[PDB]
Amino acid sequence: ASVVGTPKSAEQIQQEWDTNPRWKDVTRTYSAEDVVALQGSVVEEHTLARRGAEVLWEQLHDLEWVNALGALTGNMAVQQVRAGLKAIYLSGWQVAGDANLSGHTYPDQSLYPANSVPQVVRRINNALQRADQIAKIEGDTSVENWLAPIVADGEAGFGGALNVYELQKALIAAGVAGSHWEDQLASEKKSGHLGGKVLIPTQQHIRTLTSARLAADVADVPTVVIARTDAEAATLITSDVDERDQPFITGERTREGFYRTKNGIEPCIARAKAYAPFADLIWMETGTPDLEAARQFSEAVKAEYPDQMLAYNCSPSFNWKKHLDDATIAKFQKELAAMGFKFQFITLAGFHALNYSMFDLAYGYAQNQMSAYVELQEREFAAEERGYTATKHQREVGAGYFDRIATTVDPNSSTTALTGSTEEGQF
Amino acid sequence: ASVVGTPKSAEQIQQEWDTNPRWKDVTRTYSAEDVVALQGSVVEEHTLARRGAEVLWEQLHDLEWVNALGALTGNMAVQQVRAGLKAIYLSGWQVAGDANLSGHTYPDQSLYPANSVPQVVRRINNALQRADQIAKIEGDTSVENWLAPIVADGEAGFGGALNVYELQKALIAAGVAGSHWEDQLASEKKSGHLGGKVLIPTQQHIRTLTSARLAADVADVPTVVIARTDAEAATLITSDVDERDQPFITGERTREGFYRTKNGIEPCIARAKAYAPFADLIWMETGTPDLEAARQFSEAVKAEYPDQMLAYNCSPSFNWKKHLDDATIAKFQKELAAMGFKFQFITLAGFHALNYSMFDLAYGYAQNQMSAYVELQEREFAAEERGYTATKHQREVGAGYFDRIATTVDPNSSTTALTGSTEEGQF
Amino acid sequence: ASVVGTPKSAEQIQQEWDTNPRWKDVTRTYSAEDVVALQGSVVEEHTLARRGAEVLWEQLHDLEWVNALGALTGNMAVQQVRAGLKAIYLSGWQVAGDANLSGHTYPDQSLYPANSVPQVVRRINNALQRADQIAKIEGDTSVENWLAPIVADGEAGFGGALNVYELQKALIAAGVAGSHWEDQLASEKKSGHLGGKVLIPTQQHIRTLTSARLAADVADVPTVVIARTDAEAATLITSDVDERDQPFITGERTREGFYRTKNGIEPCIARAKAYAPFADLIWMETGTPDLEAARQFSEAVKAEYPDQMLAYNCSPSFNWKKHLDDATIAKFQKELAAMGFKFQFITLAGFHALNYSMFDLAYGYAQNQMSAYVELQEREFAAEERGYTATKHQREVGAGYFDRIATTVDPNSSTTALTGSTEEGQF
């Protein structure tokens, strides 16, 4: 007997849908009653998911554009926010390669356990929460919002609409702000820039986008839903059942029973228009960093959905200087923003920053031992004027915060950490 | 009914102890019969734990000295090996800060779930095996041994001798090559360079080393056992029961009941000698990077144990250029090796390399967007002449390997990944 | 920039502590300001933990007494509730034996990973939530509250005050209603009815209780804190520092440095009184089910703290019929309730029901194959008149629920589960 967590009435839900500007362009093919019927008698409050999704939605409208870097560890996200970024991108590619629950290194093909990204989302939020806590006790107002919104990779759902539903639900439980879903066959999922991609029917992805929204509704949070299409390079599709896809079907079939389909921007535009009512943002994977191709896509889509916001993947899978000059590179994101691409991210930033920095250090260490490390430590000290604080690793990880907890429990405790530490007397 | 995994006889074990040089200076207060009684009727083979211990032991004798860098992710270890390092250091500090099973960020005080380091060991080995697999299909002989031995942090055991036993056993099952254990009170465990450290009786740590050895023997592998003392800065000890510790006891007690003790190199020397018979390597934590203090410790210990190998923590908790000139820094590790310090490691190398590189990239990204990232990419392309291979992230993470698996299952498969990928056409 | 999760002011918190009857007899040695200082700028809502603690507190006052059985799996808790129980006990013993994150079977000695119980708490709540969801779609009002409050085993905290804090915080995040803590040395933690137990100083356990409370306050939920003392059988204590323990210290020391101490009800009474101000419930481990011993403890404690509610462990570690007659056995709990024992539980109920039920079936199966199983099924069908529902396992595990989700996403889905199932046409 308790009123804690009591579900909202179908009427209240309906009202929010009809009045909140958040749902201005959102179409739901199910009823408010349907949502309530799935909430049981208790609805858990998902604080981080709600706040994150609200902050993300706001930033997408108030800022020229929202950009982010892929993070595969908690500390990565902390450094990103400490450096001034206002969003965190959680790459599935990076999770596959260096942060998934199987413990194995995998290429980007939906090989890892379906709850891996959810765990990293939870992990990133914990890391940001610790930074937040530490900033409070240090009186550090350097960062206005440590709990930056997280946009996580839902890939192809790892199966059908039910798998999609459970993933969205888990991402929310972990505190995610937004999630993206691609129109690829889950069992043959390929990285956006790897070959051998197989698309699924247009309607099937709409079911995916619908299931993703339903989980969010049942969890009572305004999670930002992003639809991604891989039709730009995919030359295969699982079925010709959907009339909207038929125009592109060549008729040829593979041993596996797939159908050949004409790839390119035309299919992406069609699918994007079909997903628009079910997506807060739309993303088109491309084979190169091309502002003109992006313009073409944006204009064609906005021609039918003026307010449709877009997302763009500034992929490390591109050999940037091989395609663009420094001038264009420097204005790349600003131009995309000018064309409606409000969420931009470098998917594999973390994988590259982590692998390079360690290769570089290890190499130098192999040749000059301590000298190579001291150079890094000195760069860290030097970056302190830019706001860097990890040089003092103890406090950076909460040594001061836990000392506070220790002294709160027992002020006369003789086992506190920072007092007498080398960090206190050498940094 | 099978002979697979049939345990060795006590006699066979005894002969190994009596005739294998590996055990030349190893004291065991239990018997071969005791080991057998604990093995049940089936003994699991631990391939990576055996190979790693064998390789590690060998390198400790054939090389001028073995150095390593702390790694907290699989890719980290891969880069370390790719760069030439022949050993991997698994820091418990880094695990607490950014890689433990609780999902939280913690200061180095044994706050995380006890099976966290074992998981990282398993993860590191998996990552190294993938690199190994990839190198084989790429005909890459750049690296002689991808499976570098892993030396992991056992901290203070997370409890009693039984907790120690389970941790060692879990580390072995994951493929660890060596593990270190410190003489601190588990419940008040502190980072070597944090204050408020509490020592446990000398005999208690001997029970710990004995327990670590027993686990290794029952798992039938020659795991390298490292003994660590924190008596250099620790001014508290749990009890005065051990006569060997009494000389340092002042008589004063804290409100918790701890005994004040006189810290310094003197207590470290006494404990080191007491641990020697139960340690393959001995490590003394220090408050500064001082070669003279190190000599003092080494000469004192070797005076009674000439063949006793030592390990040294070239800790990032030291402000290096504040204590030494570049000349000393440059020869630091070489000088230590000349004094018997055969295993040297930079504990928090991973934390700092990861935190700094992401802050650097994120900061520049916040100001110039793409230009900041392109700079990293170009440094990566340039680093290839040094042997760096992660620029091509797809193959680096196994895309080529799984393609091989796919074409092995079905050579006519129309869903391979690398063929038609941007990496193939742009790198 | 969001108001979601904004922390309460120190004033608001202080007011709650001064006016809410919940805190009537609760002593807090820290201030509201200390709590606020640890909450960062965002406080996550813990719906289940809040509701659960409120319900548990109310039940302890409205019911003659609250009883429960140990549950180690989700389905177990579901059946317990389905059967009419209004509380779930989560035994640490059972987790060690058949449900901890190391995957190993362990005796009750704090050998498993410290986040094991929290994970089981989360699991039990998920199971109850599924049942709640199913009941709602089946219009089943059989159970008033599927979300029964969970009382979990915190054992000895797995270390110091900080480990205690993290465990309580984790239990709360998983949705626990109450948690218990014992005054034993974590590193030598023993099951209540095993020998070799080592107590810690009275004041140290008060620190544990204080830390457990602090964690709940920072988490902003009225978690029920339970204090357990093992002084009935323990003959050892870590230190003689505390003046409240000295009367029982005999002066003798063991080789490990522990002090011999006189066990019995007298030390338990002394400790219970000392813990009273920091415990919503006090529990004393006993070596036999004795109503007179229980009365002795209850009256002595209530003499100074009239409103102090107690908890009692009706342990399977007792050979019940060897100590009591059926008449006493039948009135046992009712009697304890009359004496202030408002929370009673059979710790190892799950372990025994599971191990016995499977041995019995397996044994019979090995002799009469299918006949043995048919007997079980028939007993299940029979149990349906009593309220049993697992006979139809498909709906019991949510098949009907996910069909609802499936049809909400796509009404014309041709892949629903129950339609055309053998359960639908054979049950």
Add this chain to the structure above:
Amino acid sequence: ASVVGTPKSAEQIQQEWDTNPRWKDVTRTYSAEDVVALQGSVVEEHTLARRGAEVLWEQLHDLEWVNALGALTGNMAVQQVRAGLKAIYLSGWQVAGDANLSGHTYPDQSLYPANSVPQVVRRINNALQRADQIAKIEGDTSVENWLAPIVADGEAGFGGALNVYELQKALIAAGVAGSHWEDQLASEKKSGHLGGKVLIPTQQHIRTLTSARLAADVADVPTVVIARTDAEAATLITSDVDERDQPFITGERTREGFYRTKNGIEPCIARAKAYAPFADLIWMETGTPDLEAARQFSEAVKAEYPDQMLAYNCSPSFNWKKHLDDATIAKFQKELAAMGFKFQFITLAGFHALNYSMFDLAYGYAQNQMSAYVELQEREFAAEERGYTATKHQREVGAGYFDRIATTVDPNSSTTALTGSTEEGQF
């Protein structure tokens, strides 16, 4: 530089395939060189997987038949072996319902994380290893082989051939003896006795079986591979690309693009013959327990493959007494064995034993408190004459085993468990 784990040469592998009777009827569409190319330079030994597979294979030939019950917890498997069973069945249904890594309760539709079953296989082997260890120190020869082979559910692979490969590998790493794979679309996977099942092309499942074999070969263990067909009830198939399936295709298509197909024993027989060369055992799901249908299937298959062994699911999804009489029920398994069904199992034995047993105890407990539990304890005492040993829960879970470890580390330890325990003085 070590020879430990050195891979076998292709020649050695080829010889085994040509000479070992284990591979007598095994068709491999890839070469020995292909296997070697994927093993890198180190092959980990999988003791439990090898021993288990070997034992299982042997028992499948030397016994009239091998039967098992579904196990979802370690203790469950232990009691099954204690009772005399010589194999353990690991149901995916039970894992989804009460033992998967998501912590949620799910119907049987491949909703849980892909590495869930592997974790349970590891858990089950750990539990059995403890029982083996305990038995050794107790001088208990009651059980000849505690390490009974485990047959695990690989379901539909959780994706494509690569997902299948990873699952098999993980199962093998965990120590599985055999694994089964079904010809259902993973993204729509349904319990064998639930409706809405979609089959995949015949050739596709052959790729699955081939991938499962390849994974075992690379892992260098003779894993028993089981092929399962769901064509008996499935009225849908993803594609009509395979000519072996077209005879059953009706021509109609669903909105999702699925093809209607004619279900029955006929499609099962055809698929079984096609899988034969790639399966050590073949299993067809049935809607009812029918000995004649089983004969029909068995004879038709053995007509072309005389040595092809079969597996049968004595499913709890059948209302046994509603279909058969006690006479048939009693001979059922013996009959099936007489027809080539060498591996028989009751899939949901653990779910029902666990759910019923707890409901029964909880119900009585809710009514008569302690009286209800004493009844169970008394039954447990009585069962001791049949071999039951869990009554003494302390030793059952290894308290005596760890006491052995403790006294081995320190024979003078004053903190042993069994001495002074109530189990010792009351049982």
